[PDB]
Structure 1
Amino acid sequence: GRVRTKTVKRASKALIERYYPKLTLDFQTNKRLCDEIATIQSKRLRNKIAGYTTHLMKRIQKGPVRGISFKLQEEERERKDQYVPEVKAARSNGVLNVDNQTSDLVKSLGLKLPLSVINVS
């Protein structure tokens, strides 16, 4: 086999960076396009670049595939980034839990603890 090659991958993997947008999976619409872009030798070589690409946009959609991002996947990570609201505020169990041996340094260090704690295994 059927086992892909560099020249090919590393020609689709360079391409896939810029042209994700023209970008497709009917691969017979890339084939044409993949000439206007690359400056390829051959007809055979060219039909094995786009074959690979279509093996990217058929799995991209399905999810986050690897070591390749194209200004479109990277802005859905500043949009997916963020989250939990409210931040940490205990009322419900108010007093925040503070080992009960957690009183000595901070009696020897501050101002206000609204604390939770283990009277003695």
Structure 2
Amino acid sequence: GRVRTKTVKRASKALIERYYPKLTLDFQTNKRLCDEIATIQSKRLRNKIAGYTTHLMKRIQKGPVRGISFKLQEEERERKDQYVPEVSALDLSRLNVDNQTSDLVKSLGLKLPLSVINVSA
């Protein structure tokens, strides 16, 4: 079988969250970085670790992947979390309310721009 173990999945995971800018989509280059970036005890393990990392860069190219966050993705994430339209969806584009809803406004004693429409089951 070609199922990697957790000592490979996690080692590659650590590399991407700390060295995304320097990795590429190429095995040979990633092979040499893992020598300058991590201390590994064998040629066999080092090949496997780099091989999965290449595979993960391909995934990130097509779209973000659960379980991996890096400085670039988080920065672009927070930028879109500041979004806000020009006019609120709560703001008036013309407010309609049922007959029973209207009665509620009267009891509270607030003056509002009410339009009443019929409603039925």
DSSP 3-state at the match of 1:54: helix
> Using the alignment, how far apart are the partners of 1:59 and 1:52 within structure 2?
11
Unaligned runs of 5+ in 1: none
Identical aligned pairs, as a percentage? 95
Aligned length: 120
Asked if the contact 2:25–2:57 (Cα under 8 Å) also holds between the matched residues in 1, the reply is yes
Unaligned runs of 5+ in 2: none
Residue 54 to residue 114, structure 1, CA distance change in 2 (3 Å): same
Give 1:26 deviation, angstroms: 2.9
> What is the alpha-carbon distance in structure 1 between the residues aligned to residue 49 and residue 119 of structure 2?
71
| TM-score between both structures, scaled by the size of structure 2 | 0.82
1:113, distance to aligned residue in structure 2 (A): 1.8
Q: Report the TM-score when normalising by structure 1.
A: 0.82
Q: Give the number of the structure whose residues are more often helix, by fraction.
A: 2
Report Cα offsets for 1:63-107 as digits up to 9, x if no partner: 01112111211121132335452333699972x221232133322
Q: CA RMSD in A?
A: 2.5
**Distance in 2 separating the partners of 1:40 and 1:117:** 74
